[PDB]
Ligand binder design. Structure first.
Ligand code: HEM
Length: 399
């Protein structure tokens, strides 16, 4: 069995292994860092099955759970939040924070999302690029999602820049382990103060709702409120940053589609749909252990065996998505959902928010900056390391 995770074939490409597995070995065993095994599931139909089967568990205290790194094994010791829960605990906790993220809530947030994007673009414009390129990541792709989720959580405006920087340190490839861990605990300590404050004087934010609706009645404790808030911050932010950067790069890669998007910003939703399929920037989250034997395709997954269901591979499944390796914002979509946000009850809580952020970016960026260009050759883009999820570290631009 080959070692997993696999490395991407090149900066912007999926691992090469998946297409071969879909063709000849769609349910197969891989070897994890600890020498254990796990079943890797590569076809769309089977990924959806894994994501929804009640015979499979997300609880990380089950032997067989496919931890992919030493750090993941460590992390599984803590008290879980809803990301790692099964029913009925899962929705009991997730429903505490769902309201902000519903389709209707996100539609009503659109003016705020637009204003946030607009303001960050105007700052660019004012900073300019007269002395040479600026980094679209630092100036734009990072602060857009960060400012939004911090604001929704309850962070006041004057603390956004510093906290945006500190959360980036958690995941920056250049951070040492000490720097990343110190930033993690710094953010937790910060959120703990905000919970104390909002318990005394609630405001218009997610932490206040946790405090009033869950902490005060005794349904959760203050520490639980901190960890739920922290999950909402860290689960998606680095993925959002990467998706923005990858979208800009992809448009540059495919000039005629950029021309189409400038000419018609109403194409932004379908651009974003294609982006979230083609660049599956969170590919390692659909993991389970079997609670009892389960058949998947021509394989038997025995009780206490682990499963990794690749939504990245599902999103390139030729049986579902015709010409899957073509980026086509005018794609004729099938009935089956793309899986950029997962599937089933655990499907990304923030899918509607994330798509609204991305649609706002891609309907606005090239109206603001019709001459935006990546300022290095596309083949020189600095992608995330190939043994990680797809992403872009920095992206020099002019405009
Ligand atoms: C384009 C950006 C994003 C992508 C592609 C993405 C993708 C995903 C994926 C693949 C999962 C796993 C779902 C499953 O288990 O089937 C997930 C879960 C989750 N995401 Fe996102 N995410 C994004 C942005 C966000 C944002 C902005 C937030 C928070 C504000 C967020 C919060 C979460 C949470 C809390 C979960 C766990 C849900 C659960 O297990 O019940 N995500 N996301």
């Amino acid at each position: 069995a080959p070692s997993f995770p696999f490395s991407r074939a090149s900066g912007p490409e999926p691992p090469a292994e998946f297409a071969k597995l879909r063709a000849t070995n769609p349910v197969s065993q891989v070897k994890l860092f600890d020498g254990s095994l796990a079943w890797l599931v590569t076809k769309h139909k089977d990924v959806c099955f894994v994501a929804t089967s009640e015979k499979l568990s997300k609880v990380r205290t089950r032997q067989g759970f496919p931890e992919l790194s030493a750090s993941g094994k460590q992390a599984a010791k803590a008290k879980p939040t809803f990301v790692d829960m099964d029913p009925p605990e899962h929705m009991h906790q997730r429903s505490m924070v769902e309201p902000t993220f519903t389709p209707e809530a996100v539609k009503n947030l659109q003016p705020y999302i637009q204003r946030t994007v607009d303001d960050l673009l105007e700052q660019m414009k004012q900073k300019g690029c007269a002395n040479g390129p600026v980094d679209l990541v630092k100036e734009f792709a990072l602060p857009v999602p960060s400012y939004i989720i911090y604001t929704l959580l309850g962070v006041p405006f004057n603390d956004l820049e510093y906290l945006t920087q500190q959360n980036a340190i958690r995941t920056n490839g250049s951070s040492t382990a000490r720097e990343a861990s110190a930033a993690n605990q710094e953010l937790l300590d910060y959120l703990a103060i905000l919970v104390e404050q909002r318990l005394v004087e609630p405001k218009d934010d997610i932490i206040s709702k946790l405090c009033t609706e869950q902490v005060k009645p005794g349904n959760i404790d203050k520490s639980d409120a901190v960890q739920i808030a922290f999950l909402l911050l860290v689960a998606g932010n680095a993925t959002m940053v990467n998706m923005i950067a990858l979208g800009v790069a992809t448009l540059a890669q495919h000039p005629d589609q950029l021309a189409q998007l400038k000419a018609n910003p109403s194409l932004a939703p379908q651009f974003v749909e294609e982006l979230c399929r083609y660049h599956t920037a969170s590919a390692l989250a659909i993991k389970r252990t079997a609670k009892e034997d389960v058949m998947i395709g021509d394989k038997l997954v025995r009780a206490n065996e682990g499963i990794i269901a690749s939504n990245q591979s599902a999103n390139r499944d030729e049986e579902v998505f015709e010409n899957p390796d073509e980026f086509n914002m005018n794609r004729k979509w099938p009935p089956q959902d793309p899986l950029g946000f997962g599937f089933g009850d655990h499907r990304c809580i923030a899918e509607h928010l994330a798509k609204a952020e991305l649609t706002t970016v891609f309907s606005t960026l090239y109206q603001k900056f019709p001459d935006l260009k990546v300022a290095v050759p596309l083949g020189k883009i600095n992608y995330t390391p190939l043994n990680r999820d797809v992403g872009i570290v920095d992206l020099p631009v002019i405009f």
